[PDB]
Amino acid sequence: PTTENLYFQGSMNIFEMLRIDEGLRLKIYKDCEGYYTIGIGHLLTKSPDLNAAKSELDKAIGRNCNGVITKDEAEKLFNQDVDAAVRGILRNAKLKPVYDSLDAVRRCAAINHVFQMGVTGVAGFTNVLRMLQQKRWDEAAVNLAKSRWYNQCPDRAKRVITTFRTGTWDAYKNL
Ligand SMILES: O=[N+]([O-])c1ccccc1
Numbered sequence: 001p002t003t004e005n006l007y008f009q010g011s012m013n014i015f016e017m018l019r020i021d022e023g024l025r026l027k028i029y030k031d032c033e034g035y036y037t038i039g040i041g042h043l044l045t046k047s048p049d050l051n052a053a054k055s056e057l058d059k060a061i062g063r064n065c066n067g068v069i070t071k072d073e074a075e076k077l078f079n080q081d082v083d084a085a086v087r088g089i090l091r092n093a094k095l096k097p098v099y100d101s102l103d104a105v106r107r108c109a110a111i112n113h114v115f116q117m118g119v120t121g122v123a124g125f126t127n128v129l130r131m132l133q134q135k136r137w138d139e140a141a142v143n144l145a146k147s148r149w150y151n152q153c154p155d156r157a158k159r160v161i162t163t164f165r166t167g168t169w170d171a172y173k174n175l
Contacts, residue, residue, distance in 0.1 A: 012169040014082055014108045018115055020172055021156050024074060028053055028067045032153035038067075039074035041115065042081055085115040094123045098133050106132070109163040116156065117149050132164065141165035 022041030028050070031037040036044045036053035042060070044053040050067075057065050061073055069077075089095045089110060099110050114122050123129070125147070131140035141161050144150055150157040159171035 008173065009105075009169055012108075012172055014111050015078070017108050017159075017163075017169075017172060018078070018082065018112055020175065021112065021116075021159060024071070026069055026071065026074065028057065032156060038077075039069060040078040040081075042074075042077050081115060082111065085111050088119040089114055092119055092123060094129065095119065098129045101133050103167050105167045105169060106164060109160050112160050112163075113149075116160075121149070137165050137167070 019040055024040050025038060028036055028038050028044065031041075031043070034048075035046050036050065036056075038044060038057060044056040044060070047053070054065070054067055057067065057069070060077060061069055089099050095110075095114070099107055102110060110122075125143075128140050128143050131137075131143065141164050144157075144161045144164060150161060162171040163169070
């Protein structure tokens, strides 16, 4: 690793990680599962009614957006969503002990997974959680690769899985 390469982990954090997995879009679009989304992976609603999604958006941003937001607004919503995922882990009796056992980089992978799937979805991965707590990284990654979360939308999940396997930021290099 060059000096520059050794600096790379200090440039990566949960915000940069999710920004890569989710992308940044200033207009309402449908995600790989067909759900209306905006900003940095902000799911607006699961309903197929665009009007519902716009309504959610205006509520979330606090103004008449007509389906469009600014970069600054995307960032604020993103920071709210990250905070929500972190809070969801820490208050959960099942997720917290696993999170606490993890190193810093795998904790980011955990927050990412919760950001994507929600608390109950993640907390339902009983075997994966046990494997992570036991540092069975290869098995945990293989089991995550069986999930609908990954298989329905591999590009959004693949880097998170690799990160659980390795505890490094390598999957986020060389975009
Ligand atoms: O909160 N966690 O320990 C956690 C969350 C998501 C995936 C794996 C572990």
